[model samples]
Target: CVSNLMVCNLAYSGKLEELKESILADKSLATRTDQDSRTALHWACSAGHTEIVEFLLQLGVPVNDKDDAGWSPLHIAASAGRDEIVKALLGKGAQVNAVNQNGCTPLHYAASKNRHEIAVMLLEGGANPDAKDHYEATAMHRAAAKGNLKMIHILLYYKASTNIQDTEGNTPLHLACDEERVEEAKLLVSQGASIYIENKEEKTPLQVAKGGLGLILKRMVEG
Candidate 1:
């Protein structure tokens, strides 16, 4: 039963002392998962319990174990913006570009949440700047769609392709325009994003902006 799973429960609750005792009593418990293939390491990282994370790591738990959704501890930490946990997982040899079942990597989660610092850690650790998720959307695409200027800038610095298209053939600029991310659209243009890029609908960035900020974006694109 879940209640009988001391290590998993302790990690989830961030009870560091109890977790240590549980591990001491049954080291094998350190590797136990609670359904979903989610280990104590996953819970600890998700909760940003750095101490529990370190303790679990010391117990030699798999750093890159994927849950039912294919999310690793790194993915959990990055998605939650757990900077220290991300670093710790990386230092222990977690795959920087590991993708979940959704084809989403830690960087994708970081970008979607506008977690600039976590994104930076992933990038410096060799995350592909243009890594695509299940939808063929890159971190740049996510940043633009969310209007996260700082994240967009960080991805750009890492050489993330500004004009890469998703499954819909929509580039980051197209998303910025469609989402009415005025400042982001401007930044994409400054970064040399193609204003004429078209999606599957054959709609250009201008057309996508028409319903949002077409006039303003068009003027910027024209300039």
Candidate 2:
């Protein structure tokens, strides 16, 4: 068990050379996981180890295996900005939109991390950018919160809806205010996001910013 846990840890940290040595020495060591249910693949993808991911897949390990957190190795890979690992997982028939305990999909995770390249790859691999989590927040909502202009563009290009709201009734524009990404907020407006939209608090994007960058953002959009 310790060897298996070590294998996963080494994989997650990108120590593929060490993992390879262990795997070659003890084939049973490849199937280990940590207390959190993380496997070697989870570690490899977290560390962006494309070759190790491929090797694990070729060995016929469950490509979409979920840990205790309901997170697949693909989710970790995508969130970590490992485009190559994302591709490898897809090649092995990994589910693109697998949701975790929070009801968040890999797409949601990737967007929140600002992993633009991985986001595009997941989109191309047929991941739904619009799937809402338990919070009813889509990938676009996360992009908004982070003020990620590039991710916003990519999600829009892939046809993510601007009108989707979270449980809090906050749209992408509303989220942008919190991050002070005025430029992104403006861009969302130009792309047809409604400035009049409000959260559950009845606060618009401008209301959230409240006389700071959010206020300035509201003025720019109003003009």
- Each prediction's whole-model lDDT (CA): 0.87, 0.82
Report clashes for each candidate as comma-separated counts.
Answer: 0, 2
**Model 2 C-alpha lDDT per residue in residues 1-223, reported as the tens digit of each score:** 3224788877766777898899989887777667877778877777677888888888888888798889888878877888888888888888998998899888998888988888888999999878999989999998888888899999999999887889989888888877777778778877878767878999877777644766556566676
TM-score of each: 0.92, 0.82
For model 1 the TM-score comes to 0.92
Model 2 error, position 48 (Å): 2.5
RMSDs, each prediction? 2.1, 3.3
Off by over 4 Å in 2: 1-6, 9-29, 32-34, 209-223
Quick one: best lDDT, which candidate?
A: 1
Clashing pairs in 2: 11-43, 12-43
lDDT of 1 by residue, 1-223 (tens): 2334567777878899998988889888888877778778988887789999999898788898898899999999999889999999988999999999999999999998988888999999999999988889999998899999999889989999898889999999899888889899889988888878789999988888845566666676675
| C-alpha-based local distance difference test score of model 2 | 0.82
> Lowest summed lDDT over 10 consecutive residues: which window, candidate 2?
209-218
